[PDB]
Amino acid sequence: TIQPGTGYNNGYFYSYWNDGHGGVTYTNGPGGQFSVNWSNSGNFVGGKGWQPGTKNKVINFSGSYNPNGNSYLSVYGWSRNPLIEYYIVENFGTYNPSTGATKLGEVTSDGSVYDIYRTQRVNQPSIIGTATFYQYWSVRRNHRSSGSVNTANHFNAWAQQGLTLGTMDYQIVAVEGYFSSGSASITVS
Template sequence: MASTNAYAGNITEELCDPAESDTGFGAGTFNGKFYSWFELTQEDKTDCNTKISFYDEATRHFRVEWNVAESYGEDAIGGMGWSKGSRNRKIGYNVGELTTNSSIQKALVALYGWSCDTTNGKETSQEYYIVDTWDGGKFVPWDENTNSPAEKYGSVKANGAWYDVYKVGREGAQACFGGDEIKFEQFWSVRRSPRGTGADRNIDFRPHANRWDNNDMKFKVGGLKKVIKLWL
């Protein structure tokens, strides 16, 4: 769950992106809770630009701060969740505060993770996002290969709302098999209207996984590796 300013004085631990990481990924556990983060910068900065701050109440509250959105192509992801995913995962959350001071990057709240599949010796990395709310105007994933909005693959209904579905090919750092020049795919479900903050919400992963796991998209559910909520 996200924190509000009321918890600002109760930080129990603060974690930062490791400067020694070649890919920008980091992961671990805090009080038995899995967390992970990623940051991408144009200038390969080694500063602590992404911070995850843990609060009291059995670590169910946390806050993510970032300072990397200086140009297009820079982003930060961080949050708590599970080290292994499941098609049947249901996640409850409550966002206390969501803000961005960037005119070019949005702040998103989403379910995020990777499907890492090895079949017949072939390694397949697939990244996924279920975007539930965001700060800013309409959000559509961007396809860097065509320099245009991502291709839409219809829609899916989940949690009583419609989500638009997208698929994008990427190349770069990925969490599955190491290396920073790997081709992979991104799968997106974006709610047509953002949810408000300050209320209990939930995300049911199954309808989205079922939609992606079709012949037109070919998501490999069997390779699910990481599931976390994120700030981007």
């Protein structure tokens, strides 16, 4: 495993974060590849991509994703001003992250309909420190672990619905886990 933090590997920005609990290993591979293996983890997020992201990137991903418990596979990132944490969720484990959330619409992109939601994090950690901020979600109905994500279709649908993004910060294909187990191997481009 590599040390939690951010940096560049083989031309790609990467971010690997955990809550210090133990039970997760993250490795960077050739090109845009990264692997995650976890067993009775805490909360973590790891993946490769870009710093900063863009609002019209076409993100390609391929590989395997085998969660046992609560985990997501998504295009994941942030904006600043306004501060937003966002997800385009391609697959997940035992928990759909939109459970109980307010549905803000639908968008069709890259072979599936997605349901759109907005949630709020209250006094939680963020890229600028403790803050209250919104999260935007596109949750794919047809789950998969390879494909292409035309981010503009999501960001445009969000904007159409009143979900504004500020200036992009990082933008990665991320495996997230919350107190679960699993394995994943993903290549980004």
